Amino acid sequence: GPLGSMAESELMHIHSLAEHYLQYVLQVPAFESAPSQACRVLQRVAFSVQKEVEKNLKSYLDDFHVESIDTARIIFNQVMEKEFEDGIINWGRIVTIFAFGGVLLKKLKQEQIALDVSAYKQVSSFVAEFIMNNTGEWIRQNGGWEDGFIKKFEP
């Protein structure tokens, strides 16, 4: 359709990866599913990175006030701007995008006590759109998910 087949597939993949990762983070009940190698590998690496983020930035994150989806979006965008200020993209940094998505969603759950399904869907969506818009071309140029990402983290 609007983006053409390749770009649409790319966007769908990134969305799928993001919602799968965030559901894993949150411990949303899975259904004897069989993640792709990319999903499994992303889940393993992004989860360990998220814990490193949470440990290393604890003093900052303890002072975050993620009371709504809109606040999460604002914080996400401002942090991403500061992170990618230097224009460098690599797989390590892409993983931190998913991981920080997870950090914000955990804080949102903490403030709301319980999320509804709409919350994780919306966060996964703005995360995925960021990744596609800012790093989708880089991802394509660097082997995509099956050839780049998997070969980087699970050779």
Partner: peptide, 24 residues
């Protein structure tokens, strides 16, 4: 001077680059 979200983003970049080097 710096800002909290500045510091947060710059620390994410550090971790990302460190991970990129870790799996190399």
């Amino acid at each position: 001077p710096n800002s909290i979200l500045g510091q947060v983003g710059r620390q994410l970049a550090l971790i990302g680059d460190d991970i990129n080097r870790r799996y190399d």
